[PDB]
Design a protein around this ligand. Structure first.
Ligand SMILES: CC(C)(C)NC(=O)[C@@H]1C[C@@H]2CCCC[C@@H]2CN1C[C@@H](O)[C@H](Cc1ccccc1)NC(=O)[C@H](CC(N)=O)NC(=O)c1ccc2ccccc2n1
Lengths: 99, 99
């Protein structure tokens, strides 16, 4: 689809067997999901942006369904107020910016 | 142009006669520019990043060129690791997300 940017580009994702709203985020390297349980091994990570850094749990090889499109990749879980789909997954979906 | 997201969507901007690089960010409402001098009066603003809130200087109706596209609008100035073009300006240059 073509998403206009008048409003937040929010989409419904599916991850860990749960439906969620998430922000399509071209300015995010990583995909960051509000704290939840995911299966498999994880390791700690520090990620930053405006306002400094938060500590998160990194899970690798995680399937996510993004607006109906399946993709697999690393997923970060932590204290974010907004679920964020970053470039690591937006590429798998073939998302581009156009103007 | 059509911009894939395998790398960071960095473009050149021109603001205050100065050339800078900035990040095209669909996940951001506002545009945040590293500390620089801009004409006119400014108003206060608190914005929330991933790491928490920072105080920034809000300048309105500022002329800014983004990848050869002219925009005039609100620019926030404050500590940021990266210049960020938010949706307020992305809509001015007709940017869309497509997949
Ligand atoms: C710009 C502002 C108005 C403050 N809005 C936001 O920042 C909103 C706030 C939302 C609510 C809180 C949780 C995050 C979301 C998404 N963010 C936008 C979101 O797009 C934000 C924009 C950004 C990019 C780079 C540097 C600073 C800021 N990206 C990010 O925060 C991602 C997080 C990540 N590790 O994936 N940061 C980065 O991808 C990134 C890039 C370069 C860096 C250089 C030095 C230090 C840190 C760096 N972080």
């Amino acid at each position: 689809p073509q998403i206009t940017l008048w409003k937040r580009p929010l989409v419904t994702i599916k991850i860990g067997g749960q439906l969620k709203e998430a922000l399509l985020n071209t300015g995010a390297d990583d995909t960051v999901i509000e704290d939840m349980s995911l299966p498999g091994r994880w390791k700690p990570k520090m990620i930053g942006g405006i306002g400094g850094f938060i500590k998160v749990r990194q899970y690798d090889q995680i399937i996510i369904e993004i607006a109906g499109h399946k993709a697999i990749g690393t997923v970060l879980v932590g204290p974010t107020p907004v679920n964020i789909i970053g470039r690591n997954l937006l590429t798998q979906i073939g998302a581009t910016l156009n103007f």
